[PDB]
Nucleic acid binder design. Sequence first.
RNA 1: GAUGUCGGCUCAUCACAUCCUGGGGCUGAAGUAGGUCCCAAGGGUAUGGCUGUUCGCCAUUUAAAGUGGUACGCGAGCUGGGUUUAGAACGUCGUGAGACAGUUCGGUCCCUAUCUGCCGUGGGCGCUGGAGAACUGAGGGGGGCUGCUCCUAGUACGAGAGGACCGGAGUGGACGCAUCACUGGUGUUCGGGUUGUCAUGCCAAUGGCACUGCCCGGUAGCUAAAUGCGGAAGAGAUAAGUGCUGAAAGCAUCUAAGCACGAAACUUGCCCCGAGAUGAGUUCUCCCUGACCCUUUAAGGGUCCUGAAGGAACGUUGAAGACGACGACGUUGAUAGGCCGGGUGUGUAAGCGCAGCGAUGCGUUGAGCUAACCGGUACUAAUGAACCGUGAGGCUUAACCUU
RNA 2: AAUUCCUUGUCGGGUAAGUUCCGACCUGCACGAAUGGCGUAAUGAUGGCCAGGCUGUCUCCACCCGAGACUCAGUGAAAUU
RNA 3: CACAGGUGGUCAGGUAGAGAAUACCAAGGCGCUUGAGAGAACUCGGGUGAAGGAACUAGGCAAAAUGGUGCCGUAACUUC
RNA 4: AGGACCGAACCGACUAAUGUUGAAAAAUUAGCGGAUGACUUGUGGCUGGGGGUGAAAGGCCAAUCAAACCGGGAGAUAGCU
Lengths: 122, 209, 114, 16, 120, 56
Amino acid sequence: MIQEQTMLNVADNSGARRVMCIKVLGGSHRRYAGVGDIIKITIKEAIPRGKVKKGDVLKAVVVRTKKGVRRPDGSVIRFDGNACVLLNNNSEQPIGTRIFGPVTRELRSEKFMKIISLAPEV
Amino acid sequence: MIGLVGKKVGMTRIFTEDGVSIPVTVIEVEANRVTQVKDLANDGYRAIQVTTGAKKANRVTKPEAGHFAKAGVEAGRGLWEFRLAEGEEFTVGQSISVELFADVKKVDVTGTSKGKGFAGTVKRWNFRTQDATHGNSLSHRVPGSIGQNQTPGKVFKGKKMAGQMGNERVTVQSLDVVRVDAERNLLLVKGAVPGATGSDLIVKPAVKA
Amino acid sequence: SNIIKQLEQEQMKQDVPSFRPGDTVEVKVWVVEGSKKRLQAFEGVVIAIRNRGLHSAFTVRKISNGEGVERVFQTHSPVVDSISVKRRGAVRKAKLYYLRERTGKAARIKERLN
Amino acid sequence: XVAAXXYXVXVXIXXX
Amino acid sequence: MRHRKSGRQLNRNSSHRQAMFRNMAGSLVRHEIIKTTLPKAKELRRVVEPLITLAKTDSVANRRLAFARTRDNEIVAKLFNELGPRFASRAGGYTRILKCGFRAGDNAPMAYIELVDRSE
Amino acid sequence: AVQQNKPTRSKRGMRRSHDALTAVTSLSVDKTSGEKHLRHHITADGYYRGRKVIAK
RNA sequence: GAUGUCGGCUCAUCACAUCCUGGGGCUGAAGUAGGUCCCAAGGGUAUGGCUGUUCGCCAUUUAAAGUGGUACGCGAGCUGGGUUUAGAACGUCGUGAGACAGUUCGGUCCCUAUCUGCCGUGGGCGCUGGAGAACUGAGGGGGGCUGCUCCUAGUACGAGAGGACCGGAGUGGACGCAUCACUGGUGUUCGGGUUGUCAUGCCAAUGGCACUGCCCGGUAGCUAAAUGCGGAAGAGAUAAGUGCUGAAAGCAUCUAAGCACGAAACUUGCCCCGAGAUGAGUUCUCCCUGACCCUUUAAGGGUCCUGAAGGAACGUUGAAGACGACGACGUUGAUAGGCCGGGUGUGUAAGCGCAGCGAUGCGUUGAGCUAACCGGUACUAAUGAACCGUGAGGCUUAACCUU
RNA sequence: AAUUCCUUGUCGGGUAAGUUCCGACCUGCACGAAUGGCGUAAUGAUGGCCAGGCUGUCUCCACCCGAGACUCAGUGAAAUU
RNA sequence: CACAGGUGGUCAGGUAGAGAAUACCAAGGCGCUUGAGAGAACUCGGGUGAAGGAACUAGGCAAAAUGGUGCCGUAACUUC
RNA sequence: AGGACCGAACCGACUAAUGUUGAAAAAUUAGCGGAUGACUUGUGGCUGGGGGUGAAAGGCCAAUCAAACCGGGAGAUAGCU
Ligand SMILES: [Mg+2]
Ligand SMILES: [Mg+2]
Ligand SMILES: [Mg+2]
Ligand SMILES: [Mg+2]
Ligand SMILES: [Mg+2]
Ligand SMILES: [Mg+2]
Ligand SMILES: [Mg+2]
Ligand SMILES: [Mg+2]
Ligand SMILES: [Mg+2]
Ligand SMILES: [Mg+2]
Ligand SMILES: [Mg+2]
Ligand SMILES: [Mg+2]
Ligand SMILES: [Mg+2]
Ligand SMILES: [Mg+2]
Ligand SMILES: [Mg+2]
Ligand SMILES: [Mg+2]
Ligand SMILES: [Mg+2]
Ligand SMILES: [Mg+2]
Ligand SMILES: [Mg+2]
Ligand SMILES: [Mg+2]
Ligand SMILES: [Mg+2]
Ligand SMILES: [Mg+2]
Ligand SMILES: [Mg+2]
Ligand SMILES: [Mg+2]
Ligand SMILES: [Mg+2]
Ligand SMILES: [Mg+2]
Ligand SMILES: [Mg+2]
Ligand SMILES: [Mg+2]
Ligand SMILES: [Mg+2]
Ligand SMILES: [Mg+2]
Ligand SMILES: [Mg+2]
Ligand SMILES: [Mg+2]
Ligand SMILES: [Mg+2]
Ligand SMILES: [Mg+2]
Ligand SMILES: [Mg+2]
Ligand SMILES: [Mg+2]
Ligand SMILES: [Mg+2]
Ligand SMILES: [Mg+2]
Ligand SMILES: [Mg+2]
Ligand SMILES: [Mg+2]
Ligand SMILES: [Mg+2]
Ligand SMILES: [Mg+2]
Ligand SMILES: [Mg+2]
């Protein structure tokens, strides 16, 4: 459950360290974004020689949440932190070339197939 | 089509081989016995009156006992009516079992919702609470304004206010039928239905379809 | 009561091994990618067990690729193929939620020698 | 406004 | 809502209620017949009767358990030496409530709660 | 907060239309003592349903 | 001889000069996308940064972020930041007291609801002998939103770039209703750890108090963040609009006679209430089959006998409840408590033995304890009675028995 | 600027976005030298702004423990008209 | 007013504690002159809270948080 | 040593909630400032109304203050209700 003002960790090598969600895209009065959902973000902390800089406004897809994901049998997978992967503002498509940490099977959708291939686990 | 009178046994789940858990409500549908058949000539409309279950003999009043005796059926715990669909004929004394729903697929379940007593506007009508701090004086969960000024000079009929919540007839539509077990007199439907455990339910084939 | 009990009993598995909180357990789960059905392993420490008949569940915590991951499994689901205890653990508590704020050496559990 | 400038600093009559 | 909830609050806090019923249980064991308000009598059954059930098996552990709940050695002795034996063959229902009228000072419904054996 | 007109004696009586008390209707008679008592309550002498309960 | 001001919050309601969604005409309308006008009020119609602001600008959304009326809606509903009391200062004006197209810091918001209204919930009487049920439905209310992807189809169209209508499928946002099987919250009525101190003679073991002393878990119930369902299709009559046949007016012409299409608006279809619908309805079943007097002689009064069906009261109570009400049960009995077995929770009690200088560990032992849960069981409490309610139910016409 | 009407002046910084804030410029409507000018370590229940921690302040409220409210018995006001 | 306010001086036990703070007690003194039930909305005084963490608001108002002793270590600036 | 520091008694009164026909004609609860001094407190004394006293608010002078209270001129005068 990510909303505006929520800070997230970055699970790629784009160069960002901390990002803040500024909009939950999708509909009028949409409250939360979970896992596969796309959000508008602003970069709060970044490394010196990265592809992105502090203050940049772009898009990201959530990959890990503390709330977690429910499965058809009723099971739930939870993580210790909230993480997202930065996407190009225009054509989505991950800016980074490496994915760090496990992702979930909710991402395989052709839109995010590149992420699945690069993820270490699941 | 006609429906049947059952009882809410409780909720459970059905694991499918695929690995999907289906939340189900167990409805005990015992045999429904026809006590009266309404016809256009005598009553002005077509319907069947049914009874189900059993009742203590000492609790059956003589007026009620006489009614059951004419039909020739044993006394049940109540009486319910079902409107007929013109192509449907039933006889007095006939027993109808849960096998009626063998190939129905979707049902509408009617029951009495659980009673919440006197409820406030926040709970009853989803009103937003006012500020908890920042100076608010004794007005955290109060309704707020209830009208305008002199022009109307009154409160309009239907204004959402505090009052009795629950304990009323409710119908949930288009519920998938999961399993029909004639041997055990059981009907499994996906999802929750109105009422508490032990409450009477009215199950009918879905109208929306 | 009796009716629901009977329905639930018919679906319960008869091979569940005995495990206690603190034990390292390996759970095999069916993963369906298209039409290919394979088995994936999830190994970690049992931190919670809900004993509730057909509705029994247990929570397993592991540190994967630098990230803490918890998975709540439904015991009698057909998705869970097999459960195997790898190591026995000695704890005093029924629920081990204190392990969420402990890492590395501080999160180690002593072995239950019986 | 009709009744401004303050009355009882807000409580009206007062005295008490 | 109080759906399916058990226990009377009796316009008291939790600690006060526990202490009051502990005293009342001792009074009933000692005198075998006490007069109180009808609501209090109904609630007392769920405190005294479990103590009599506990007393039917005499062991150090059980005596200490009874002490923890009553905190009176005279009461503990009577439970294990007299009441236990007297009610050995009775399956529950050791007390009887008899309604007796209304209290003069406040019109409170009153009742007499006594042990079934009595025979005083 | 307060009335604008004095309510009449008529409206006063109408409000008190529901203030009447109800009598007990029936008093039970003990089988042994023959003493009247409120039903399901012990008698003044102590008898209840024929038995001399209570020594007072 | 008082109608409290701007903005915010809460809660709204109507108009249509329509912002979105629906229908249509013209286009300097190829398609996609637009312009403009007509019909249409069913539903829907952002969150933040700055400022007391309304407004506005800016950032990022959305199908869209409509315009107005309602004492510029709403302080006996909330706030009190701005204006507009008494303190103080700056700029400015004045010889001065003081003052302002001005700035700036600080500065008590009262009311127990009689009536109307509104949301809920009862008592009385009526409905024409009394009673227990099931209904019919006059009438009233609720609901009515919409994105994206895929197929049709890279088809129609187009030099190319681009790129459809109509029709179908899937999956979302917001909103609503129900529910507790799951994931969770709470769980001062369950189990455990622990600090200080007091007490139970002391040891050991326990209890009180310190916010439940502080904490860690957690049963039932309640519940959302949890998971089921909904908005429809169809029908009728239409709006703008499009027509067919067709004169007046030998031609034309949608109209005058006649006939057909046509929208989220209207009447229905879906859900809930509903015979106080005084126009008080219908159907089924049950109960009562006695004598006498009197007078003003009639829908008259009284006496004795009788007391039905059913109801109420009382008691044990409920996933029902402010109180009434409503549901279950009262010995021919599982209604509540207890008790028995189980489950669930906590996590290996006490006592004893062993090892150790000791703190402590190990064995007995997954032990002991276990609320609201499940299945049973008359042990305790639901007393025989009494009370209310009667004794065949008006008149006038038809029809019928018996035309 | 506790002083600037025009005015949210202009430029720079901070923020995704800053009528407030900080640093500048000078065009000072209408600063200015004991009705003192400009600096200034320490101090302040002083005015303005930003950050970390923290949270039911809020998204959006849920449950629980007490005192009232509700029912019964005793006593028994008020403004207003 | 048998009113939750005000009123100078003296005395000064135990365990923990720096203490006349604070917690539990001693000597001693009290349970506050309406009670009994119930366990609705709403108000008052409190406890806990999934994910988020000032998005609230004129303003972090209120709440939450920090909190002890010993030792190590500590910037610009300064009237030292 | 100190109008030094932290913090009870003691003296104050910055914020919030409650209360506003109050428990109280200025309080209660939770926080808050000073706390060896220009400190605080008991008993008695002195200053009197165009007067006093005032680390100055037109503050205070017996719940009263841009001129106290009590009695008198006095049935002041009211082109007003
Ligand atoms: Mg206020
Ligand atoms: Mg106030
Ligand atoms: Mg409040
Ligand atoms: Mg119960
Ligand atoms: Mg009380
Ligand atoms: Mg306590
Ligand atoms: Mg006037
Ligand atoms: Mg007037
Ligand atoms: Mg129009
Ligand atoms: Mg319609
Ligand atoms: Mg207005
Ligand atoms: Mg008014
Ligand atoms: Mg204020
Ligand atoms: Mg102000
Ligand atoms: Mg002034
Ligand atoms: Mg002045
Ligand atoms: Mg007010
Ligand atoms: Mg729970
Ligand atoms: Mg000891
Ligand atoms: Mg047991
Ligand atoms: Mg049972
Ligand atoms: Mg700038
Ligand atoms: Mg700000
Ligand atoms: Mg000057
Ligand atoms: Mg000079
Ligand atoms: Mg100066
Ligand atoms: Mg007193
Ligand atoms: Mg006093
Ligand atoms: Mg005091
Ligand atoms: Mg003290
Ligand atoms: Mg939280
Ligand atoms: Mg949390
Ligand atoms: Mg803000
Ligand atoms: Mg805001
Ligand atoms: Mg604060
Ligand atoms: Mg605090
Ligand atoms: Mg000092
Ligand atoms: Mg204080
Ligand atoms: Mg100090
Ligand atoms: Mg004078
Ligand atoms: Mg004068
Ligand atoms: Mg004169
Ligand atoms: Mg005069």
